[PDB]
Amino acid sequence: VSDFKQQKLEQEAQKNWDLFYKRNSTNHWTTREFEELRSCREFEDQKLTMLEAGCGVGNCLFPLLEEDPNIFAYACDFSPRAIEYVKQNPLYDTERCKVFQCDLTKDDLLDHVPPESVDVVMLIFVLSAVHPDKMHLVLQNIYKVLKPGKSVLFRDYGLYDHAMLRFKASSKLGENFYVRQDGTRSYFFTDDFLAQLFMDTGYEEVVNEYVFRETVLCVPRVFLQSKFLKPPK
Ligand SMILES: Nc1ncnc2c1ncn2[C@@H]1O[C@H](CSCC[C@H](N)C(=O)O)[C@@H](O)[C@H]1O
Numbered sequence: 001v002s003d004f005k006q007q008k009l010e011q012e013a014q015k016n017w018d019l020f021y022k023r024n025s026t027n028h029w030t031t032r033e034f035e036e037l038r039s040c041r042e043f044e045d046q047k048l049t050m051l052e053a054g055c056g057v058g059n060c061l062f063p064l065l066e067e068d069p070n071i072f073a074y075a076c077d078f079s080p081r082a083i084e085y086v087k088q089n090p091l092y093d094t095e096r097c098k099v100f101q102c103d104l105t106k107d108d109l110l111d112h113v114p115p116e117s118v119d120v121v122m123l124i125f126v127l128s129a130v131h132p133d134k135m136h137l138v139l140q141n142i143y144k145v146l147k148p149g150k151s152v153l154f155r156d157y158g159l160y161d162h163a164m165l166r167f168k169a170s171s172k173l174g175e176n177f178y179v180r181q182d183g184t185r186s187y188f189f190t191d192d193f194l195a196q197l198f199m200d201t202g203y204e205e206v207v208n209e210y211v212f213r214e215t216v217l218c219v220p221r222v223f224l225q226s227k228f229l230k231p232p233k
Contacts, residue, residue: 016183021081029060054126073097139201158224
């Protein structure tokens with residue numbers, strides 16, 4: 001295990017993510033995200049407001065803004081370089097999306113998104129970054145913004161995913177919890193763990209299924225793919 005370095009890696013979780021956005025090129029969302037995105041819409045062109053948590057460069061989101069022109073995207077990420085990288089992109093349309101630095105385990109989302117304002121939150125490959133101790137914090141932060149009948153679309157690394165089977169016991173922070181070389185972490189989800197996180201934080205399970213996919217020598221990538229709902233009043 002990494003012992004004290006863990007507290008160091010946690011303390012620097014933003015920085016390594018910020019550094020990751022430094023060195024790397026801008027450079028994944030399945031159709032399920034896009035297809036389920038529209039299923040949250042009752043009127044055929046109902047205007048939907050979506051929070052894409054952990055936006056990164058929003059490489060996946062920005063086409064979705066073009067593909068569907070009648071949705072608003074509150075996008076946040078705690079990497080400042082990440083945000084500017086989306087700020088710099090020409091596709092950025094201040095009308096389409098409000099992007100803002102937020103560490104979801106620290107910053108109340110009501111600073112930028114009105115409470116119960118968003119139709120759908122996308123937790124795509126983000127919860128694996130945050131420390132498992134603090135994950136429910138991300139879920140509490142996003143409950144505040146979810147309309148009381150709306151849902152969270154979650155895709156993330158799942159148990160026994162390729163990356164989990166590639167890591168040496170030296171990258172292992174703990175059970176199903178690993179640090180990538182650049183110091184960003186990957187937690188490899190199990191259906192039960194995510195379910196409890198969502199149950200504890202007040203959501204209701206719609207879909208919680210492992211999804212197996214072919215990496216682009218291939219061992220399947222295992223992604224835990226799920227939909228959770230804010231219970232209605
Ligand atoms: N506590 C936190 N608050 C905000 N963003 C976080 C975070 N922990 C991790 N992240 C973000 O998690 C992301 C993992 S990759 C995100 C991009 C992905 N294509 C997507 O659609 O979500 C990084 O952009 C990182 O900055």
